[PDB]
Design a protein around this ligand. Structure first.
Ligand SMILES: [Cl-]
Ligand SMILES: [Cl-]
Ligand SMILES: [Cl-]
Ligand code: NI
Ligand code: NI
Lengths: 114, 107
């Protein structure tokens, strides 16, 4: 439930490799890549204190709330821990609404898949 | 672990979705199709599953499995480099393990 974050970097062969970590008690997320990088990966979980799930950007703080917002809203709806990896170029806010609506449609049609 | 994917025509793109359902957790991936497939999770030896569709590239499934072995927990690996040379991958794995030894409370 309690999230901690870490990052580190290393020169391996002739390239800078960048690592991000998210630690929960029973789960670990390891991300390997380059720096700089996009910060489009989030996790949210239902707090038992508030009705609003706490959403964290796993790849470093960002002011873009697309992934954190989606994760939070889906965690609210499903009552489980939700990771979102949002890999779309098009960050028009209306496009994101279309995407979110499509996800909700799938959840209505196939609740057992979520 | 249960996997699902779907696509939708939204404006002038296919938007592509991948879903992984565990009992406690859900992973949603949004992007384009076709796409890279280098995201895995391992849990219990630990068994590794590719979240983004079957692949012959074992970089992330291999890494996840090895780190899940070492840590005894569920481990996701997202491998975002082009270089999938197995010697390079071992260097990557070793660097992670060094960090785990130095800062065990961060893992
Ligand atoms: Cl470099
Ligand atoms: Cl089609
Ligand atoms: Cl293949
Ligand atoms: Ni970073
Ligand atoms: Ni796919």
């Amino acid at each position: 439930g309690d999230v901690s974050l870490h990052n580190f970097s290393a020169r391996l062969w002739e390239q800078l490799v960048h690592f991000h970590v998210m630690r929960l008690t029973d789960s670990l997320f390891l991300w390997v890549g380059a720096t700089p990088h996009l910060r489009n990966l989030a996790v949210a979980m239902s707090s038992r204190y508030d009705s609003i799930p706490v959403s964290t950007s796993l790849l470093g703080d960002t002011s873009d709330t697309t992934s954190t917002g989606l994760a939070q809203r889906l965690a609210r709806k499903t009552n489980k821990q939700v990771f979102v990896s949002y890999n779309l170029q098009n960050t028009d806010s209306n496009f994101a609404l279309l995407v979110e609506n499509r996800i909700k449609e799938e959840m209505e049609a196939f609740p057992e898949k979520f």
